[PDB]
Design a protein. Sequence first.
Lengths: 105, 166, 55, 140, 68, 78, 121, 97, 42
Amino acid sequence: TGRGTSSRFLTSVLHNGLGRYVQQLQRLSLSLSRDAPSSRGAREFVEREVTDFARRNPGVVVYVNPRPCAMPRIVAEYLNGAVREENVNSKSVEEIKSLVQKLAD
Amino acid sequence: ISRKWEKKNKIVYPPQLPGEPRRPAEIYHCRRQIKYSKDKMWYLAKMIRGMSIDQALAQLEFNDKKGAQIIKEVLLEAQDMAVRDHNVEFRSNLHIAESTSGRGQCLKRIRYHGRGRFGIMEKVYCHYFVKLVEGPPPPPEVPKTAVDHAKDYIQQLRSRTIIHTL
Amino acid sequence: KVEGDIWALQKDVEEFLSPLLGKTPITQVNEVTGTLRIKGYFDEQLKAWLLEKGF
Amino acid sequence: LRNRLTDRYWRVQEVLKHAQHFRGRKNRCYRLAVRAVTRAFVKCTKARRLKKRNLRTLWINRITAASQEHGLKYPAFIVNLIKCQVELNRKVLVDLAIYEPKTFKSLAALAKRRQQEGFAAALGDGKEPEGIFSRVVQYH
Amino acid sequence: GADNFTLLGKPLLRKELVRVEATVIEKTESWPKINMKFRKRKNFRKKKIIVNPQTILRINTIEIAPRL
Amino acid sequence: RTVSFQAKESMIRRLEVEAENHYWLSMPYMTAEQECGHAAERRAQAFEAIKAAATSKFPKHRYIADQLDHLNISKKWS
Amino acid sequence: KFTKSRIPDKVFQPKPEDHEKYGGDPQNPHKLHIVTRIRSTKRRPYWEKDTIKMLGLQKAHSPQIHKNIPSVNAKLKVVKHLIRIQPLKLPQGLPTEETMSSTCLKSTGELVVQWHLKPVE
Amino acid sequence: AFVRLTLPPPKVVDRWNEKRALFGVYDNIGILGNFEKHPKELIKGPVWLRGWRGNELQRCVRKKKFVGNRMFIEDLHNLNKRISYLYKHFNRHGKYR
Amino acid sequence: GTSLDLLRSLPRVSLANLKPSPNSRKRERRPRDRRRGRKCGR
RNA sequence: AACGAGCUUGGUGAUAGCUGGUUACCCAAAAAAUGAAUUUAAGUUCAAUUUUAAACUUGCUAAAAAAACAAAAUCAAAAA
RNA sequence: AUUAAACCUUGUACCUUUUGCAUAAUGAACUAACUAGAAAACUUCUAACUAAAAGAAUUACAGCUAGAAACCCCGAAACCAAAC
Ligand SMILES: [Mg+2]
Ligand SMILES: [Mg+2]
Ligand SMILES: [Mg+2]
Ligand SMILES: [Mg+2]
Ligand SMILES: [Mg+2]
Ligand SMILES: [Mg+2]
Ligand SMILES: [Mg+2]
Ligand SMILES: [Mg+2]
Ligand SMILES: [Mg+2]
Ligand SMILES: [Mg+2]
Ligand SMILES: [Mg+2]
């Protein structure tokens, strides 16, 4: 799978830490259903943990969009232009919080 | 079955601006259900690839194969529609950008054998496609010189890096 | 057929049966069904015990 | 046919996506592709262990080349550096040889220096005092 | 080490001499590594994916002091 | 098959290690009589721990909260 | 027939030169053994396999402390060839409750009660 | 494998049609009605399996017992052959003796 | 009965919230995977 | 158009101790191919093993003398 | 792995069997679809009620009642009946 896949060298976006450290995650989007079993854990994340995460990370803009939805989805966008999307369907509050922190790091 | 080759002549580009090279015309033509093997037709289609319209016709006129006349007739029709419908000024100013053969829908029949045994024979059909591009044929292939070969070798040497280390 | 705090009954049963065993009895509390299950046969002692309490 | 599998398209693409860089019908025919992919994965897993050992062999060769330039065999370089309480590993010793030649020459001189002391010590019989570079820094 | 001199610990240099400072730049996970053993009836699904947490450190400074 | 030089030494090295093992097993601190009973208490307690776990198997408790907590799957924002 | 072996007693009767070589006094014998497994029980008879598990020497090169008493020694003699027996030595005395967490077993066989990881100075 | 290139028409289900809305009513006809009727008497189905359950050999024998005398020749011949096959399967074949 | 007070807090009981008693249902095994397929236990 | 006994349909999903095949993942444990009977040795039933659950208590290694033998196993106090 | 597709290094196709062994022997040109474990006597788990349980006929010296939990596919030479 090494020869069936691409590879690169170790690198940083803009010499991230030489002068000052900049957080690469810049935007998080959370889509919810107001009344849907699969989005329950995400709903609890918004009630309890989303506000604390935003305060701890003031350089990330967090968008929470409650709307009729079949699967909750988290979209993460970085300064280099990369975008990562995660299905949050029927995950517990802790898993979502654990995943959200990984995106920030 | 799909018939996308015919549709390609219907593409319409927007008007070109004054400061732009003139876009060469392209004409797509085909003859579909030809009673002839595509394997046999490939050789005739292969030979005329890259030639001018007149040069292709001259070679086809003196080939003994059945497919040569079929390709020649298609080429003449492509030439006429190019000037008649596609705003090509000079009939001679055309070259074969693409020429290939494809499988057609075939019929299954019985091949009789010695002891009441049989085989399944195929009555084969094939398609033939061409694209004619306005302009002189692109310049022929130029082989690499010895100096060019040497230059590539030295570049490979200069690209070497110390492997598996800091 | 236990109604109320089934855990309080477990506490009393353990104390009542501990001296007889010399060790704490092993018990299961099924809070959904309202029953208390004890390892070993103590039906007669528990029947007399529950009569004194007046149930 | 009350219940027919409807997702076989994606189950097939699971294997074929790993086989697209093969040559021949292995790269597109599932019955052949699946057998090839299973051998590729087994080879990848076993190659993970082999990669570490091959890198060490590469380092030892590169260290031998570097030490031989100063006149030292590989065993003499390694053991006598250890006897000086220098714990540089073979991977780092190669980085110094390629990129820090002046430092590596110092290590060669230190290794040869300690080696000579050992030769004198064995002939010394223990009456002679211990060499300057042969002293061991104790820890507790 | 420098251009003209080097200091070797036995096995480690004293804190007074050398201070090396680094910063954590990224906490990440490795790309999926396939772990598939060879067994009778190997199959394509008798496969494990190993993903390991990773940390990236940028070395910031190396400083020395005259305390030999 | 002539035996290699390295093969011969490695056997000798192992023999010397075992030869020393003979020496250290030749000086028992306690005699057979003195040994009797010195560890009786610890052995007695250890088996009691073994028996206690073996004879303590019983089903687990069942709670109403487990059954009723399933209704939270339909929890919502009003 | 491969069978369990009974060693003649003379093997375990040492000689005066042996005490000088290994530096052990025939009087004041050591109390505790340091035993490590240095060979595999694969390809060895099952009785040798059994004792190795009884003695706790399942992992190789990991030391186990055992009593220097005849009953234990009898088991060790069964697997003598698969193990290294080293006398446990206490230069600074037995570890106490205060020093129980600061011990370290050295390769020399000495259990130090103070482990600092600092130059001796 | 080949997959649909279009989405099928969406399925529209009326959850409050009369049949869905009133499903289950009178399932307690006995206990709430003084036991004049057993709930099984509300089951609609083949005459030989209203308020009854069994394995396939039992069902085949029960259908023959109930409506065997009103069956068509093709059907009755097929039913009888099914009985003999199931009889040999259940009484002679299987892992467990 | 505090348990009835718990029902007051919880969401409505409905056909979508139903659950069998724990361990009331065993799993039926079909001979499809490698574990129970192949020779199928025979 | 392959008769030591035609062909077609049906009985019929004949029967086959025989050959072949028997479709997702993960975790755990695991025999042995020994003894006995069988128109039985290409199979089956029982023992023996293995295994799951449960009950409660000693098991494994070792094991002096001492008998039984004739002049390394059986037995198994104490201990460890 | 590599700066680099091939060069360098590592590596005795799959299934089925054979004694746990494959340089054995079967089977597979390839694609798509189809194509093979099924039952409740005892046992276990989950509940109702309990010296009684079951909506008639049954079991019962803690039982009884209900639920859940199980045992493949293709293939002969043949035999018989009635037609042709
Ligand atoms: Mg003919
Ligand atoms: Mg053909
Ligand atoms: Mg190695
Ligand atoms: Mg296996
Ligand atoms: Mg004939
Ligand atoms: Mg059959
Ligand atoms: Mg047979
Ligand atoms: Mg007979
Ligand atoms: Mg005993
Ligand atoms: Mg043969
Ligand atoms: Mg089944």
